Amino acid sequence: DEDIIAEENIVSRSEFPESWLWNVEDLKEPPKNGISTKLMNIFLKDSITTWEILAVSMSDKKGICVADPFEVTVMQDFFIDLRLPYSVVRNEQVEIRAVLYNYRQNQELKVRVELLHNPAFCSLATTKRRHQQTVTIPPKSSLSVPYVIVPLKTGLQEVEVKAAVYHHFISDGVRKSLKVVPEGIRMNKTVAVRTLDPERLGREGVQKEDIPPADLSDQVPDTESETRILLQGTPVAQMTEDAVDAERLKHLIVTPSGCGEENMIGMTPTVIAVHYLDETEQWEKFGLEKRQGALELIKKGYTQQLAFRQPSSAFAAFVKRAPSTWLTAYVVKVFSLAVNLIAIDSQVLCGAVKWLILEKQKPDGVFQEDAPVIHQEMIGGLRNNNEKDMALTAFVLISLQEAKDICEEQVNSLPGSITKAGDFLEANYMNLQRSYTVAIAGYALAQMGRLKGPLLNKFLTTAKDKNRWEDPGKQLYNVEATSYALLALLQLKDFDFVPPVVRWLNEQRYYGGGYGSTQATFMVFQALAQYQKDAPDHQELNLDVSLQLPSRSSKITHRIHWESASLLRSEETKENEGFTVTAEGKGQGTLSVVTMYHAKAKDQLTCNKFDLKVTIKPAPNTMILEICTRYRGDQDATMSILDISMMTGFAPDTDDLKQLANGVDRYISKYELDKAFSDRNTLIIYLDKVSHSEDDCLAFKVHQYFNVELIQPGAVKVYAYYNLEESCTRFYHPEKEDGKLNKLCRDELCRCAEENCFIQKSDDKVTLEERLDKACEPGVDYVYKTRLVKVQLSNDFDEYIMAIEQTIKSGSDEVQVGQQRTFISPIKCREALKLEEKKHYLMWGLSSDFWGEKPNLSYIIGKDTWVEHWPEEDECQDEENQKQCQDLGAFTESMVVFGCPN
Amino acid sequence: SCEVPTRLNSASLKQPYITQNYFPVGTVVEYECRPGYRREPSLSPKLTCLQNLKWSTAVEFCKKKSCPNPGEIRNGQIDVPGGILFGATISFSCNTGYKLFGSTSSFCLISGSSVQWSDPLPECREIYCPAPPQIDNGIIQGERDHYGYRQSVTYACNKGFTMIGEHSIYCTVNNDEGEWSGPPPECRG
Amino acid sequence: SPMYSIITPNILRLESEETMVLEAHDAQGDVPVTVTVHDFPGKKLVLSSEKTVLTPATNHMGNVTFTIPANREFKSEKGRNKFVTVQATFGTQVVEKVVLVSLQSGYLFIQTDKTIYTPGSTVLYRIFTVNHKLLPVGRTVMVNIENPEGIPVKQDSLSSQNQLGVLPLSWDIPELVNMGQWKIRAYYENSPQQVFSTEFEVKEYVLPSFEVIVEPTEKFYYIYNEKGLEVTITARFLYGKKVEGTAFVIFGIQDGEQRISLPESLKRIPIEDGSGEVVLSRKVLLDGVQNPRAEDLVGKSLYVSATVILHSGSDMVQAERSGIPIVTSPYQIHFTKTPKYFKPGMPFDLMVFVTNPDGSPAYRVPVAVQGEDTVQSLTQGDGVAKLSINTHPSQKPLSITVRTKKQELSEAEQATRTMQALPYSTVGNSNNYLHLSVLRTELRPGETLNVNFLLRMDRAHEAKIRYYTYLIMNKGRLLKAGRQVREPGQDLVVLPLSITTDFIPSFRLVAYYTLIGASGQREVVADSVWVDVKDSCVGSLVVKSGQSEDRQPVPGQQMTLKIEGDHGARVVLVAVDKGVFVLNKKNKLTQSKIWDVVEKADIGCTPGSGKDYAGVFSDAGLTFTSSSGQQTAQRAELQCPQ
């Protein structure tokens, strides 16, 4: 128009982030008082608001620092706030608000506000008509402008309103987008939950696991669905049961005293207690400070064991007594274990090893004993006679290989003696009867790995109930042979046969110390410490989880080892696939797969909390607006709001408002009260309460102050103060039926129809050339010479069953001469069309005016549909009609013979 | 009479004063902004001829034309040395871990009836590192499709093997080229 | 006679410079000291090894600063705390002590751009990787993102090397997602137990376009205030202008997590010129609860729900103030800042801490000891008062009760509180004490503090105490060790201790003396104190406007942003629409929450002192070990006692 900013020059505000300026700057400027000062230019977005700017710094000297917020307020003297919702339902008619703010101190502004037409939305502004209201805004005030729409395509869409003032150079535009969403409701289904554990049913051929996809047959079209998948880890990882509590070893800290033998009986429980505690890391529960003090006693046992060491490097009860081999093999055994604890001399230990080898070894491999120890109980089971060439050669043997690493380079005859005593236990192992002698002899061949075959079998078979090596007599022997056997299979890696032994000794609850409890204590704690250091087969659990989904090409492996603070792995796919998952290792897991989507639903809960009926009837100039509402609870609702918008160019009656305003549980602010008849398109009626038993009805007169041709349906919305969401919004228009804007829809596809019912025109200026040019551009798809056989009336959409009398031009509908095609039109176009039965018409339209499929196609008379009355035969002889019969007849043969130019 | 109106960088005379030479005293000449400058409503585009044979002194009638806001570059930056007015220049850069694809600079040039940036806004593409090495007797604890700047890869040897080296390695970026911090570990049997 | 000592922190940490204080008392000539650190109990390695010489000219005071590398021997397994054996050889005399080792490498902070988000958007979040001293470090960090129900849906593995302790990160929330509270969880790879978390909300929302602030006149309610709880409902647009519309306001009573709505307090009030007034009368209140007794409401709280609707009906905003305490007293008193043990016959100092019902410090509030009106003291900026009472020599439990003496109010409204301080047990009842006093003031870095050393002991041995040893603890480390000269006869000596940015936010001073007395017994007498410092930035960071103040900004305008900060530093900005902070303002980032974390990770568990000297030490977060056997208690726990 005149003295206004045109529509194409105006830039709508589009940039409305909720956060921006996610930037990184470096303070490298010359510092003043250790303070550097940086200047940055930034282009502020399109939002009309206040930004809060938060800066965090990091300096290798001053560390981190969070700065105080800095607010920047961005404004303009005149502007618009287009207040959309987060999302809206597709095909659902809704109202959107656009508030025009005028913050000029004392200068009113005559403004024009226009909504732009968007094919995705069916509103009043179209292709062919603008929708502009002219309204006045007083100084320091706002003016609300309501628009009603219906979203035509799901997905994101875009509303954009523009506004300009008269006589001034002020213009503003807001371009906001909103998500249009499908009706369905969220459903979550479980696809597969299987337990991942190789060995138990998941065969040694490691478990393979097939997972089908989800049903999703009731998935509403065009929606993504995500498949999440989880691998829940198992916490269960008992070593055996529990290591023995340190509080149970308090008696094992003994002051070593006496001669060559008893002092070893006193150094035994102490060395083996700390060794076990260092390995079970129970030093805490026990008392950390107590370690230093037990190490001093181990050093005291060793110093005092130096005084009974004879020149031949051997040991005996006294210095004048002949040296005992077993004793010296015990000295070697214990000192080989208290190497990591105290500072053990190599000359002494290796000297006693050399002595044992050169003096105390027979050619044939068996140690011989010359001078039995005085303390015979300290020997353990070796005392019970029978095959002591084995019990002994296995004892001195175990002492020698445990002294291997320390005296290999100092003693060169050691590998040969070791092998020597091993070939002999090897030849005579099958002739052993006692459980003890075979448990030490097998632990003695276990270390060289020379325990195989039949000897192996006899060793395993030896044990009763697969958990113990017991012999008639004292139990201490049986616990000692059991501990040798436990060490024997820990060397064997035999992690299956271990679980039951461990349970047996813990069950025995032997905590060492007692009469002749030297071996029992050294073996039960070397065995339960190696049970805790070797840990057999983890004892914990190891699971590889390889998953294959035909979507990705890559293979995904998930290692869920124990002692890792997670025990959880989850992966997700945007596509519902059939994927198979191979797992592997020890351990019991689980695999649960969940897909998510929206299924078909009918819904329509809303109004969930409120009923509403709004009827608009004519007055006895003005119309009557009655509102009727009701609560859907068990109680009467509290303070509710009645939000009303008016139909365009209409204002409520002041006196009727005054009459509602006075008490009766109803209220209206002085504000809505002193608005003049002008410019009052919005209104709020406050309700002290609403009933739940019956309808609460009110009603007031509305007057038309401003006359316009395309008027916008009014809208009423109820809702309790505490809840916005649980609301109801009905629309109201005197004629418009249902309060629904005209639109033709099938299933979920609909198209707006608020436009001219057809190409508006009079047969006089429409010449032949204007017919050959308009009926041959590309868009035009079909053009027929038709005749109206039947007209079908309804409440909303008319059906003009046109019988094709000639196919002038053919549009994708492969229609032959004689067949019928239904033409549909809104009721508001019955008056503009005046189609009559038995008459002929020249019609043509686009391909977008198709409705349906091929075996039942219907035509829709849109704004590009050319509807023209073909005069009958006895009307063309008439001279005033001639120009039209002759133009239609020339258009018939100019399109039938030649057609289009191309 | 006064000499021809002096050349102005912003506005050029209108018709038909541009071809005149007879400037009797008390004459007004009208200018129209050049490309690219815009008229300043509050200011008169006319000039007048003085007694000592001079013209009315005036500051330049058309102000300099502005370019459209350069915009924002997802994980990149726009260096604006000196404004976005007609004849201005801007440069582009990407944030570490991202590579530049397109023009490294843009110019505010005159197009048709207005000024427009010479080149389109380029793109910063995530610089991916090459796929992590597969080690013998070990695997990569829960791998990944793509490893970017700073993404790390954790390793794990199989049962019966010992790990000797860095438990994991990370992706470093040098000259838009992704390279591993270092060699992966080894699982000695 | 020579007694060699060694002092370190209760808990040592990995990849951090731990300091160690070495001493030889009544020693002569030079003394070679070698320090070694071994793993416990294996002693498989040599993690640290330093050599130094103690000389009479340092008065035989040494110090070794050592580092514990992050060997793979240190982690696990599992839930099994680990330990080191600190060894200190002085010539021929060896002193060793086992200390606890923390895996915690330091801290991580997470910062998101916004507080709340819409399905379909991107969450931008930065991780700040810093050691215990808060400086940036480059390490590997695991990052998880958990959903409402507490389920990880994504895990990444990253490192802040060359990232200057600033690790940028992003996460695209899918449009199909569970509403509610989401969590970002992050931890250092070498220390998976200590986790650092931040919550962000995911919800279907829109910007209100205006804000509503509800303010009760008092930040509390006094049960006998007849007027009742009067509240001012202010409402203004985000861009500043005041709002015209109508408000509904309701009141409620909360007890823990259970809320009771007061239906009869529901009012509808006209908002004129962007403001409105509404009052909850005591009557309605007592009527809504079924109790006649009013005092039963003390301890509970009140909440106010506001609903302001624009006269256009185009925008409606909801607000709520919560946790308005119902109290008999407009103040509260806490001894969380006072030590729990005195020294018989010596002045005992009280650190009274007066808060406002919310938890904020109460300025200028006089307090006093009952039975002693002389003893009076006012609260400073931080809300603390320094009261001092002279005590009698006796082993009887000191019980001290304190009240406020704020004028204008009544005795009934005054607050009160009662603690109990036990006596410091002396080595074989030698009756030899030490007391450290500090001037109570809001301390700033740059100021100089006057630490007061008061010694009490029989004249038979004072002439032997020539010096005190002090140690400063901070952030859980040893910031500085040193010596205080004392001449014979000097009851009170003063230490001029300069305060730097390194003392922020809080520091502990523990000092002690040793001597031979009684019947040839080696005696150590120690005392500690905890001093608070003005929480702030080590440096400074200010953001403000570069242009003129007159030039208001316009949509699409170029504007100048001035940034004043520390030279060399890197600044990371963000700009959020105040509409966001109308929906959710929680889990914001502040420097104070940083100092808060730093604070929660102190190894010191007491305002100072201790039942004994090994207690003063262990309580302050230290281990004191000697060559005559005067040792501390073995600390088995990483956390502080309940």
UniProtKB/Swiss-Prot annotation, chain A:
Record's subcellular location: Secreted; Cell surface
Lineage summary: Eukaryota, Metazoa, Chordata, Craniata, Vertebrata
Disulfide bridges in this chain: C122-C752, C350-C407, C607-C728, C628-C697, C745-C750, C757-C829, C776-C900, C876-C885
PTM comment: Complement C3b is rapidly split in two positions by factor I (CFI) and a cofactor (CFH) to form iC3b (inactivated C3b) and C3f which is released. CFI and CFH catalyze proteolytic degradation of already-deposited complement C3b. Then iC3b is slowly cleaved (possibly by CFI) to form C3c (beta chain + alpha' chain fragment 1 + alpha' chain fragment 2), C3dg and C3f. Other proteases produce other fragments such as C3d or C3g.
Effect of D278A: Minor effect on binding of C3d to CR2
Span list, region Disordered: 203-222
Result after altering D405A: Impaired binding of C3d to CR2
Effect of D370A: No effect on binding of C3d to CR2
Residues of the full protein shown: 752 to 1663 of 1663
Site entry (Cleavage), positions: R203, E204, R552, S553, R569, S570
Chain's gene name: C3
Glycosylation sites: N188, N856
Impact after mutating K533A: Impaired binding of C3d to CR2
Name of this protein: Complement C3b
Chain positions covered by the region annotation Interaction with CFP/properdin: 873-898
Quaternary structure, from the entry: Complement C3b is composed of complement C3b and complement C3 beta chains that are associated via disulfide bonds. Non-enzymatic component of the C5 convertase, also named C4bC2bC3b, composed of the serine protease complement C2b (C2), complement C3b, as well as complement C4b (C4). Non-enzymatic component of the C5 convertase of the alternative complement pathways composed of the serine protease complement CFB and complement C3b. Interacts with CFP; interaction takes place together with CFB in the alternative complement system and allows the complex to become active.
Effect of N412R: Impaired binding of C3d to CR2
Site (Coordinates Mg(2+) for interaction with Complement factor B Bb fragment (CFB)): N902
Phosphoserine PTM sites in chain numbering: S217, S570, S812
Effect of mutating E402A: Impaired binding of C3d to CR2
Cross-link (Isoglutamyl cysteine thioester (Cys-Gln)): C259-E262
From Swiss-Prot, chain B:
Family according to the record: Belongs to the receptors of complement activation (RCA) family.
Effect ascribed to mutating C171S: In CHAPLE; increased complement activation
Disulfide bonds: C2-C49, C33-C62, C67-C108, C94-C124, C129-C171, C157-C187
Subunit structure: Monomer (major form) and non-disulfide-linked, covalent homodimer (minor form). Interacts with ADGRE5. (Microbial infection) Interacts with coxsackievirus A21, coxsackieviruses B1, B3 and B5 capsid proteins.
Mod. after translation: The Ser/Thr-rich domain is heavily O-glycosylated.
Outcome following mutation: S103L: In Dr(a-) antigen
Function: This protein recognizes C4b and C3b fragments that condense with cell-surface hydroxyl or amino groups when nascent C4b and C3b are locally generated during C4 and c3 activation. Interaction of daf with cell-associated C4b and C3b polypeptides interferes with their ability to catalyze the conversion of C2 and factor B to enzymatically active C2a and Bb and thereby prevents the formation of C4b2a and C3bBb, the amplification convertases of the complement cascade. (Microbial infection) Acts as a receptor for Coxsackievirus A21, coxsackieviruses B1, B3 and B5.
Comment, domains: The first Sushi domain (SCR1) is not necessary for function. SCR2 and SCR4 provide the proper conformation for the active site on SCR3.
Tissue: Expressed on the plasma membranes of all cell types that are in intimate contact with plasma complement proteins. It is also found on the surfaces of epithelial cells lining extracellular compartments, and variants of the molecule are present in body fluids and in extracellular matrix.
Disease entry from the Swiss-Prot or TrEMBL record: Complement hyperactivation, angiopathic thrombosis, and protein-losing enteropathy: An autosomal recessive disease characterized by abdominal pain and diarrhea, primary intestinal lymphangiectasia, edema due to hypoproteinemia, malabsorption, and less frequently, bowel inflammation, recurrent infections, and angiopathic thromboembolic disease. Patients' T lymphocytes show increased complement activation causing surface deposition of complement and the generation of soluble C5a.
Sushi domain ranges (all copies): 1-64, 65-126, 127-189
Positions spanned in the full protein: 97 to 285 of 381
Descriptive protein name: Complement decay-accelerating factor
Superkingdom, taxonomy of origin: Eukaryota
